[PDB]
DNA sequence: ATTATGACGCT
DNA sequence: AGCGTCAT
């Protein structure tokens, strides 16, 4: 009763840039705006691999991880933008710089954790407190939430339903209690409307967002109403929301662990987990996962929003699938050199922008026929931002994988250079 | 031949 | 340190 903490102490948002690479290409080329369009990488093998898809194109069944030649069967008027190719590989600089534009605007409002190029977590707890003191008991108008869904409402025209749900929520609100978690989430949602408006004004980019009390619920909420909308998931909404939520939809349970939760416990939905004791869950899935699951199925998660706006690693990777696998010494050296030259460019720009230096180089390879995605991962010291030295060291570090008697065997199907372990400079 | 990145845990 | 998991 009075002593079960309910995980309502924070306001946390997850912001996800809608089909981000597509938006970047649509800003640059207005002929692509408001059309079915996708971004591809490469073009020879079956038209290229699609990696991002506008919502217009999604309506035709176009998806990521689809060959462009196949997407054209589903959507013959599909428009395509190609990722830049530099030194023989895909070069994602345009999207990294667009992402920095958006992240810098987000950081004006609250502290953000860069989860990936197109999504960030937002710690709004302090921001909401400041805003609540500014209001001085003044009620929150629907006009302040023009794109917000309240999950679970209305109970008892899509825009019409959104507005009905929002009215029901706002009528119920107790504005005089500056400590009600539901009020705190509502003000969080107001601030996120303002943040998203600023992003769109100042970049042209639209995004979706979730607002809740922790990162996992914010991430789940964000996906409920897309594109260009935001969703508030209150603590009270969790029992019904989880009662028909497939376990795989919760962040970190879409993989082998979620599959084993489903198979070992014989359940399907997140809410069914509430029936098990914390000890039972730990006994099946380990102490950490078990405690996490016990709290998570009750809407409770404690992972903090880490104050981290910059990537922790700077990486360069290329697959060489099928008969493109690298089979000679000269091939491996030339591609290590291309990877190392892009790595050097990005590292020098990073050092000048962000006052830090990487100190460790990680080299990862895949060999043909090897079941694993990484056949080997080894580290060496990263002392100077010099492409020839980095590629020479990466070779020096992988060279004893070659089993020939100038040839390379087994041929390599992936090269990967990652700069890690940053230190202030 | 479901990229090229990124995040993180286990031991 | 090297390997495995999860996500888009």
Swiss-Prot record:
Domain UmuC: from-to ranges: 12-254
EC number(s) on file: 2.7.7.7
An annotated Gene Ontology molecular function: DNA-directed DNA polymerase activity
Enzyme class: transferase
Consequence recorded when altering residue 258 to V: In XPV; impairs translesion synthesis
Entry GO terms, CC: cytosol; nucleoplasm; nucleus; replication fork; site of double-strand break
Binding site for Mn(2+) 1: 16-17, 118
Assembly and binders: Interacts with REV1. Interacts with monoubiquitinated PCNA, but not unmodified PCNA. Interacts with POLI; this interaction targets POLI to the replication machinery. Interacts with PALB2 and BRCA2; the interactions are direct and are required to sustain the recruitment of POLH at blocked replication forks and to stimulate POLH-dependent DNA synthesis on D loop substrates. Interacts (via C-terminus) with TRAIP. Interacts with ubiquitin. Interacts with POLDIP2.
Record remark: domains: The catalytic core consists of fingers, palm and thumb subdomains, but the fingers and thumb subdomains are much smaller than in high-fidelity polymerases; residues from five sequence motifs of the Y-family cluster around an active site cleft that can accommodate DNA and nucleotide substrates with relaxed geometric constraints, with consequently higher rates of misincorporation and low processivity.
Name of the featured protein: DNA polymerase eta
Gene (name only): POLH
